[PDB]
UniProtKB/Swiss-Prot annotation, chain A:
HAMAP family: Ribosomal_uL24_B. InterPro entries: KOW, Rib_uL2_dom2, Ribosomal_uL24, Ribosomal_uL24_CS, Ribosomal_uL24_KOW, Translation_prot_SH3-like_sf. This is Large ribosomal subunit protein uL24. The lineage of its organism: Bacteria, Thermotogati, Deinococcota, Deinococci, Thermales. Belongs to the universal ribosomal protein uL24 family. Gene3D superfamilies: 2.30.30.30. GO terms for molecular function: rRNA binding; structural constituent of ribosome.
Swiss-Prot record, chain B:
Belongs to the universal ribosomal protein uL4 family. Part of the 50S ribosomal subunit. Signal peptide: none annotated. The gene is rplD. The chain holds residues 100 to 151 of 205 of the full protein. This is Large ribosomal subunit protein uL4. One of the primary rRNA binding proteins, this protein initially binds near the 5'-end of the 23S rRNA. It is important during the early stages of 50S assembly. It makes multiple contacts with different domains of the 23S rRNA in the assembled 50S subunit and ribosome. Forms part of the polypeptide exit tunnel.
Swiss-Prot record, chain C:
Disulfide bonds: none annotated. This is Large ribosomal subunit protein bL35. The keyword Ribosomal protein applies. GO terms for cellular component: cytosolic large ribosomal subunit. HAMAP family: Ribosomal_bL35. Gene3D superfamilies: 4.10.410.60. GO terms for biological process: translation. One of its GO terms (molecular function) is structural constituent of ribosome. Keywords: Ribonucleoprotein, Ribosomal protein. It comes from Thermus thermophilus (strain ATCC BAA-163 / DSM 7039 / HB27). Belongs to the bacterial ribosomal protein bL35 family.
Length: 107, 52, 64
RNA sequence: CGUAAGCCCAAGGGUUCCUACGCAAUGGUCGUCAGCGUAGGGUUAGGCGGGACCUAAGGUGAAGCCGAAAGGCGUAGCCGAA
RNA sequence: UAGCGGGCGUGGAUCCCUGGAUGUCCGAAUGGGGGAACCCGGCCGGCGGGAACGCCGGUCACCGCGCUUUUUGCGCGGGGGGAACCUGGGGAACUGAAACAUCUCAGUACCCAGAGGAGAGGAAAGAGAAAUCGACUCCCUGAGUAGCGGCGAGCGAAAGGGGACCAGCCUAAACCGUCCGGCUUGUCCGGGCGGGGUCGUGGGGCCCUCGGACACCGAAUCCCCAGCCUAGCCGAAGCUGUUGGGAAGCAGCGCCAGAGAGGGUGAAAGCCCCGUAGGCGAAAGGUGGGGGGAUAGGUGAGGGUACCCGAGUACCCCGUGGUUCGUGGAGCCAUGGGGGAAUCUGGGCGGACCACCGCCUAAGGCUAAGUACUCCGGGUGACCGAUAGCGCACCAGUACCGUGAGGGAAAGGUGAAAAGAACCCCGGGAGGGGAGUGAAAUAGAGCCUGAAACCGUGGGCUUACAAGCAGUCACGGCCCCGCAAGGGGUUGUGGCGUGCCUAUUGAAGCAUGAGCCGGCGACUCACGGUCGUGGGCGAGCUUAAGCCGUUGAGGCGGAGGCGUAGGGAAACCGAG
């Protein structure tokens, strides 16, 4: 329900601070808690070495989430904002004085 | 009483001379731009105020 | 809200145009027979003063 | 102790029962123990009890009779017990 | 909110919006019963081998209105809720009068009944004095005036003037007919229907003559549509350096604006995000007199007749209520017992009563709006900040208490992020101690910021021949900063000294209240007065409701108030 923010499902930069000015993967969005995960927040998590899912010293982590509005879209340019447009056959949403958004599927 | 106020208000302003009475304007249409330019033409820099 | 203005107050006394409460002499309805006409003549009017100030507060709204 | 302090019934309480694990809190101290926490489990009916049987004081209540109202009384009928 | 886990989607899902289906047992409860949420039966279709027993579906409550062959069914409606507000029938007491009866609180609290986005009210048998008015209701006004009153406490009108909205209608009667019923056939006693008719310088009826029409007026009712809310969609501008865990901050150079409201982003931004102003959007649903079509409907002038115009009535008595009228010289309005009429020479009324003069047509029923309320949807606040604010921010009408009615809490903050601590070590665990997580672990998990009492580890000073509201003055020593000269903490001696509050004729009192600390907790406001003051005007001065406007914008509005003369109880006179 009108839960429309910004970030979607392409690949894009970091404008926060931890790893500001960096870039990462598809971005696997989750969820309404305004969290997005490119590759940014990487940590090293404990998890008891319990012989099941953990060897003789589990202590590993990878993708830890990070807030949405702390990232930004980049077009073949630098990193400028977005903007929509109706194709009279779909819904395109390019970039500030640029073309294309997240519609390389035929959009 | 309050009417004096009205009068006296402007009166003080007029006692200073900060009131312009242009018949119309040069920034006729609705644009921040043209009013800004006209504000150069009136010299109303960027450190004043408009009960306008 | 709004003062009640006393009915009796106006009903028996008047404050003259001076903030001076003036009206009635007391004592004539059972007097008589052995009454000298001297006092019946002096039972004409009176004057009142002092506490009559509070009496001016009584009437209030219409004054009178 | 043993006309009980032992053993049945009944109203009551609402899973305290059995079994395993376990003590930080509940036991006027402890506590490896429990009417304590926790999980799996246990309550079987044509003849016992009770209704698809009966009436009691009483309740109820078409009709009736009455009351400013809400209601009050109330026949037949229906509810009512260990 | 995860977790053993397993699906799901651009052949467009979760998701919100509308419409339908679906909804087991209770609850007015409705087959009947009943200790609500459970039990039992009839009656048509069915299910199982299915008559034994079972289930499922349909259907079975009374109340009222109109029909229907009174017989039997159908027919439209009824029952319960609701935060406040509303109409009616009931209705107090404290308390005010410094006591108490009249009076008062008060026709308020509550009891009940009923109607709804409203109510009730509402077409004058009125008003009031002018030959002036013209449905009902709300705000201002008049006015705390007119009066009511143990003439006490106090209670408190209407007309008029200003705004608010603005609506006016239909039956019974006389005339005439159609069906039915009875009947002392009779120019016939009633019920239904049918046209007829609705008024106050009187209307209606009948005959009759002026002349009566294609017309004039137009609904409160049904339809058409703009519109309004139930999902939404668009939306203008940024980049390097730099300290810092963190940049948005500070530096440099801009950009946008009909949009620099605000929230968020690891700090404090119009340009990073959601937004902003500005401007668009509904298949279905609701809503809709905002703008439109039509239907039911409504419009005459004269002459005589004397047919009609609301009956247990009007009026009279008795016993009342209401009005400001407490019985007053006591009317008007409505009504409980009895007495008991007229249709326009009948009549009710202008406050006993009468002459007169004006006003109004009762004894039948409907009517939007202007007003009110706040469960609810939005906005807004010189509103509160987790003892405050709804009683509750949080798992509250929950714990708990009570037979029941009912009472009624306590409890919010880790961090930007869970990264919420793997390993080892002591340890039975409980909890710690290195490591590691982050800016910070002085953020370690009821953890922000942790104050006060409060217990305690260590250190400095002094205390075992002393009699004390616990301090103050000075001297002195002991311990620590200071360049010196000065400062600090402590206490050996001695000069001195009856805690605090309240309450008193008077307290240290053997009067009074406080264990300690923490939070809360007590001179407000609205209206009318009276006085002083800072002001504007000033022989005048100022508007109330409301109209228009504005989003934190004012103006318009002279109705009304105080002022100019007072004196007398009054007529009435007048600087007397």
């Amino acid at each position: 329900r009108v839960k429309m923010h910004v970030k979607k499902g392409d690949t894009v930069l970091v404008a926060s601070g931890k790893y500001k000015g960096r870039v990462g993967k598809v971005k696997e969005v989750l969820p309404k808690k305004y969290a997005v995960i490119v590759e940014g927040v990487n940590i090293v998590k404990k998890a008891v070495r319990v012989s099941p899912k953990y060897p003789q010293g589990g202590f590993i982590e990878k993708e830890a989430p990070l807030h949405a509005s702390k990232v930004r879209p980049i077009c073949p340019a630098c990193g400028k904002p977005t903007r929509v447009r109706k194709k009279f056959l779909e819904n395109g949403k390019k970039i500030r004085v640029c073309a294309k958004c997240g519609g390389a599927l035929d959009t | 009483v309050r009417k004096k106020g009205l009068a006296m208000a402007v009166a003080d302003r007029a006692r200073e001379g900060k009131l312009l009475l242009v018949e119309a304007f040069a920034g006729v249409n609705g644009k921040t731009k043209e009013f800004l330019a006209w504000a150069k033409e009136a010299g109303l820099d960027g450190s004043e105020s408009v009960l306008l | 809200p709004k003062m009640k203005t006393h009915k009796g107050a106006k009903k028996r006394v008047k404050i003259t145009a001076s903030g001076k409460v003036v009206a009635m002499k007391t004592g004539k309805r059972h007097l008589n027979w052995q009454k000298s006409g001297k006092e019946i003549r002096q039972k004409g009017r009176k004057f009142v003063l002092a506490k009559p100030e509070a009496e001016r507060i009584k009437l209030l709204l219409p004054y009178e």
